[PDB]
Amino acid sequence: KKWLGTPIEEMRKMPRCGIHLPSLRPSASHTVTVRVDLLRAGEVPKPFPTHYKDLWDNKHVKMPCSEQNLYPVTAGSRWELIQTALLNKFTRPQNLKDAILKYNVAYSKKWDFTALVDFWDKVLEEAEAQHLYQSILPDMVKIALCLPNICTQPIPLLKQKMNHSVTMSQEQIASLLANAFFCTFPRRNAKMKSEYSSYPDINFNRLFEGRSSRKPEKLKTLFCYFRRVTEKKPTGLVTFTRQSLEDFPEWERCEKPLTRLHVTYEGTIEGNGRGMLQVDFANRFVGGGVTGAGLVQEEIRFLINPELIVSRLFTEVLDHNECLIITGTEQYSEYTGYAETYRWARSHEDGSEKDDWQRRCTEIVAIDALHFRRYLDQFVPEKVRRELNKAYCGFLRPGVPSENLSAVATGNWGCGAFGGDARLKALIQILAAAAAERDVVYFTFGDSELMRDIYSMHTFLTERKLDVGKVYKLLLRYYNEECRNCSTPGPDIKLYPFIYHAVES
Ligand SMILES: Nc1ncnc2c1ncn2[C@@H]1O[C@H](COP(=O)(O)OP(=O)(O)OC[C@H]2NC[C@H](O)[C@@H]2O)[C@@H](O)[C@H]1O
Known part of the structure; x- marks a missing residue:
């Protein structure tokens, strides 16, 4: 049997479980960058304000089209330099390289474009390369240079400790990412960097470097996205929300019961968690090394839903008590394989429903697990x-009642690159969801024994009526009784057998 627990169709999904969405209006906690009054279905949103307003301070994104974006000639407008550079024709890779370097002269010998030249000539066919520079690259420049006219409102930086949302359009995001592709964002490339050292990289320069055989598949995935939004402008909105809590459960005395589980070894979070809160196994610098090396769960999601990539422009590094909730992004590509075997399969027409704010019902949460440098460290209380x-x-939605919350679609969070133990992390998540009072759909990603063990454990704890606080205390018991006074890196018994034994006595 390929799944266990509650049947998947008894789990709450969006937009069916949701409360009627109230009127979309700006707020001290909510930045909205479109004309709400003119917001209609299938209609490309209008910007608000109508004409470019600029801020160049330490609270908002420094835009390439700002008058204060200067370069040494006398002080010259780097934006005029960007327009000059990109309005040239592209015949070969060198002409895009030389163009991007015009306004990034400091990095003229730190930036390699080997992956791009190989992609242009070797990987793609002639009719594919010809279509790239005669249609796709020109249409990317148009949307990039229209940034002033599309992104009229300052975008606030989502700093540590801020509980704030920014609601933006897909076309606006399209423009910003187009600018990122051409490495136009100022003050965002320094190594010794001061201001944006706590933000992830945004400019795409590292996508052209290296001799990795997966660089072309990243380009294909992104050019699939760029081709799409260029041809037919997207009409949706995307909300990015930074959540930062101060009051967490007192886990040891939490009387809340466990909730329902559906767990399967077939399917994926993105493929089979539609209408559910889909976890992104993030780096605290959101997006990971999507714009560089790195091609695992987060990066892949960031590439097939590239409108997530823009969060890197405004999202400060996540502290332990924080996550980034992105609602509205569209999936543009399909893929095969994973990491060194990842490949772009084809375009994907997203058939998701949209909400009263014209966002696609796709909620992704970025939560960074800890990167454990050795296996035993994660059991320390x-x-x-x-x-x-x-x-x-990641799970709690205060402001929404629990019966109006979807299930969480998650998986082996923290247990790939970050060396976590899936059984420990499964239980951690199940306990988190229970405190947050939501159901869990778990994808073990091809691992059947793990599915059985997770189910059996959930069932055992449910039928003995043990609450969060009792299970938490068992985990603290596991460390003290079997991990603390431990001879070699491994203890004499594993977590699950210990729980079974300790509860049965
Ligand atoms: N699409 C999908 N669905 C369900 N499960 C998946 C999927 N893709 C991968 N996985 C499983 O999740 C596991 C964890 O993936 P990983 O990306 O290693 O997550 P980590 O949290 O350990 O890694 C965090 C780091 N990696 C990339 C980020 O930028 C972080 O720096 C991995 O081993 C797989 O078993």
């Missing part, structure tokens, strides 16, 4: 409380 607290922040 403070590391357990941290991961619980991170997941709990």
